[PDB]
Amino acid sequence: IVGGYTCGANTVPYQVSLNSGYHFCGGSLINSQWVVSAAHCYKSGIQVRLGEDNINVVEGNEQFISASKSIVHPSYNSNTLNNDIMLIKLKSAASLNSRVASISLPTSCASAGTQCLISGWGNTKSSGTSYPDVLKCLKAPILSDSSCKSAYPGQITSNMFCAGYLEGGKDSCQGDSGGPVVCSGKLQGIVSWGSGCAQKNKPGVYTKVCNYVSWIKQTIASN
Ligand SMILES: [Ca+2]
Secondary structure, three states: OOOOHHHHHOOOOEEEEOOOOOOEEEEOOOOOOOOEOOOOOOOOOOOOEEOOOOOOOOOOOOOOEEEEEEEOOOOOOOOEEOOOEEEEEOOOOOEEOEEEOEEHHHHOOOOOEEEEEEEOOOOOOOOOOOOOOOOEEEEEOOOOHHHHHHHOOOOOOEEEEEOOOOOOOEEEEOOOOOOEEEEEEEEEEEEEEOOOOOOOOOEEEEHHHHHHHHHHHHHHHOO
16 A cells, blocks of 8 residues: 555454465455455465454464465456456354454445545555555545546456546555455455556556455355
8 A cells, every 4th residue: 555554453354464475465354254355366375364463473363264265256357357356265264353354245336436445565655665564554535437447548347446546646556456445334346456556647446346246145155
């Protein structure tokens, strides 16, 4: 997250870190057994880390649970990043508490202008490189589909939306991928892609979760 703020420990209780020896992507806890992330974050050997603030220090609220199964969306295209969503099942159920909590799925799509909270452990610089240990947060609005399409000609599908600031300076970034965009208490987006990070006229692009609720629910119900 570039241009954001330190969230505070366990203030984003649905945020998870995906770990394969090292943090590599975010995700969102949606029930005791299941995490939502980006399909481009797929790899084997995932350990889901819940209850994290500093990802390099054991602070006392963590739950580390190996994944048993990951399910990339049936129509994910890694070239275009269309349908950039996956589900990860935990080998054992998380113990839910005030610091480790699911986030609700939406019931309708969000609208341009809605404020959302974007979070992660990704790069905090737009030119350089600095990775934080504690979780970072950014409040940002959803942008109109027309401004999103104009910013990225030929690239924005109906399964994507833009959020952020056309002026630059405030965005998600590498290492935030897979993490949440939450608006009014609902998971509306997944950190997906962008041109660099925090660049003028290049807002962040996010997977449009509302399009996937049926698939998420039916997948959980039979897995
Ligand atoms: Ca920790």
